Symmetry: C2
Subunit: 128 residues, 2 copies
């Protein structure tokens, strides 16, 4: 069901990790300060863990989602920054997997959308 996307992530973990770390770092340069590379790499790795627990849907990864959202809040990432990052993550995955295009986009969207919206929810909850 989410097999094509899931399997690609599983098979391309090391390259995704680097890709997404680099995405966090690039976005951070637009912010008033930049955390260290290891901090962004750990966020990336936690995220990938979430994706690999989320083959069915966002439910299995409940505890890691809550941890990641709390961590984001605690270390000073805005919702704006996190949402921007997560949007860029799936788009950079697309470029990797694309390499029909439209059906791939919809595959990616079906796997990620509920994960990301649950992460957003738990970020807001970790203030609410």
């Amino acid at each position: 069901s989410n097999q094509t996307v899931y399997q690609f992530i599983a098979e391309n973990q090391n390259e995704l990790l680097q890709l997404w770390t680099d995405t966090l770092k690039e976005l951070s340069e637009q912010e008033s300060y930049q955390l260290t590379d290891q901090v962004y790499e750990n966020i990336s790795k936690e995220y990938i863990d979430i994706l690999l627990l989320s083959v069915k849907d966002e439910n299995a990864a409940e505890s890691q989602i809550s941890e990641l959202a709390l961590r984001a809040v605690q270390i000073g990432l805005s919702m704006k920054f996190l949402a921007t990052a997560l949007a860029e993550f799936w788009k950079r995955l697309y470029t990797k997997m694309n390499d029909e295009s439209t059906e791939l986009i919809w595959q990616i969207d079906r796997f990620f959308s509920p994960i990301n919206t649950e992460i957003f929810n738990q970020y807001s909850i970790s203030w609410e």
Copy 2:
């Protein structure tokens, strides 16, 4: 440039308002209570008004953004509900536009909406922070 998407929104305002109002309503049916048709219509209208100010970026609609997000909080829409709704809003606009490359249309749509929606999510969360 966001000209292509902006123009389609500008030319199809009444249609989009109905489409988005219906999406909200459909989604509300899975929540523990439903608000009124007018409440959801007013949300769709406030959102479209944001879009029409946003041809460059999300900055001109700062105040409108902040008001929409705050109202969402106050009326009891979760972030989950809001983020699901907004995702469906662009996807439904895609189906409309696409039926008039598909891939480049999606990226045009994403380019326009993504910074607006992220800013909405931010103001939603900030209402609590």
